[PDB]
């Protein structure tokens, strides 16, 4: 559509669910809670395609894809145990580890595992930023994903109670045309993280840094991520 610059951008950032406009079921057309930050809750046709034809958010980035070979090598080098080497008796207390849906093995101390994998992704290490690492806690599964099409968005990492985006960064980002300090150098510094929908379930976001301050009654007090700007949920 070349009727206006907004239509072109929207058309180039358009989605489509092959459920069929003929369908009269309102469940797939409804605005699910998971359209937050990944899709515009407002941008959608009002005709016979409500909820099916969507539009990506401003900060939405669909994964391109990556091979799980290097991750499997790091895990094997780690204390992880393969699937054929283990005995079924050890699966009770041990935690599973999936990769692109393929059950690879199990682990014993998954806490320090994710802390390691997360540290690697935040340093642009073997694990790329587009890699999703979901650690279901109640269910001991740990699903890692490198497939393409996994819609994700960036978010500001959060320390114990403070952000990692200090003032020295904003300074370098202001002189972006001189010191060639761009978004990529910001991600490599471990300040920002690409979070996907499946990982948002295990993530505790903060709408603004004001929620990180000390209040008369602590609501969460254990934030782990923060939003750059809530307006980014719009298309």
């Amino acid at each position: 559509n070349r009727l206006t610059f907004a239509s072109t951008l929207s058309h180039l950032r358009r989605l489509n669910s092959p459920i069929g406009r003929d369908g009269k079921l309102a469940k797939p057309r409804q605005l699910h809670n998971t359209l937050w930050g990944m899709v515009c809750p407002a941008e959608t046709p009002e005709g016979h395609a409500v909820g099916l034809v969507k539009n990506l958010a401003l900060m939405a980035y669909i994964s391109v894809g990556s091979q799980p070979s290097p991750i499997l090598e790091f895990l094997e080098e780690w204390s992880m145990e393969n699937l054929e080497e283990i005995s079924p008796a050890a699966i009770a207390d041990a935690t599973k580890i999936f990769v692109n849906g393929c059950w690879v093995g199990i682990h014993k101390d998954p806490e320090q595992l994710m802390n390691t994998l997360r540290k690697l992704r935040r340093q642009m290490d073997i694990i790329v930023s587009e890699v999703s690492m979901i650690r279901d806690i109640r269910e001991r599964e740990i699903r890692i994903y490198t497939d393409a099409g996994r819609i994700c968005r960036p978010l500001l990492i959060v320390e114990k109670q403070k952000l990692l985006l200090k003032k020295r960064h904003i300074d370098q980002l202001k002189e972006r045309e001189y010191n060639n300090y761009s978004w990529q150098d910001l991600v490599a510094s471990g300040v920002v993280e690409y979070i996907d929908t499946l990982e948002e379930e295990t993530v505790m976001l903060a709408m603004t840094p004001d929620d990180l301050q000390e209040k008369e009654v602590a609501y969460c007090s254990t934030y782990t991520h923060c939003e750059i700007h809530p307006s980014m949920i719009l298309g």
């Binding site: 391109v64 079924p88 699966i91 692109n100 059950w103 099409g149």
Partner: protein, 169 residues
């Protein structure tokens, strides 16, 4: 598909609608077709904690439903019989099931040989998820959850065409 029969023989039977087969198949028959005849080894792949009798009592109907079969060859012959291509001779029936359980059933886990253990472990977890859902220990998955969806962009899209056409070339 790994389904559970609705209540109304004695209990709820678990089956498996494998590809290239037009008839439901008990999960135990599939486990035996992969080289696991002992019910203990089978449950060890499905149930990881034998101290949970609630899950063991829920899978018992499937065990008692398929107990005449106790070898890998007979299980493969049964699977081939349930399909729409029942070979007159039991030899090719086993061959048809062997290549089906090796190529069409869970290709992402592996299509080569000697991977029967990986398929069983995954098929066991596949049943483990079904028991947890029926016992309420886990919430059902939402079809609209985009964490369970994928966006096919030009990359994964154009690749499908080039692959199909390169074959034609």
């Amino acid at each position: 598909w790994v389904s559970m029969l609705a209540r109304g023989a004695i209990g709820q039977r678990i089956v498996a609608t494998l590809p290239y087969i037009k008839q439901e198949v008990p999960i135990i028959i599939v486990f035996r077709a992969l080289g696991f005849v002992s019910d203990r080894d089978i449950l060890e792949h499905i149930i990881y904690d034998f101290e949970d009798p609630e899950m063991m009592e829920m899978v018992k109907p499937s065990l008692d439903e398929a107990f005449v079969i106790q070898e890998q060859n007979v299980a493969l012959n049964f699977i081939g019989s349930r399909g729409a291509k029942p070979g007159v001779t039991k030899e090719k029936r086993i061959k048809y099931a062997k290549e089906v359980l090796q190529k069409e059933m869970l290709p992402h886990v592996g299509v080569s040989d000697f991977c029967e253990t990986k398929k069983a472990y995954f098929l066991g977890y596949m049943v483990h998820r079904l028991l947890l859902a029926a016992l309420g220990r886990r919430e059902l998955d939402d079809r609209d959850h985009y964490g369970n969806k994928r966006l096919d962009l030009a990359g994964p899209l154009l690749a499908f065409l080039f692959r199909g056409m390169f074959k034609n070339l």
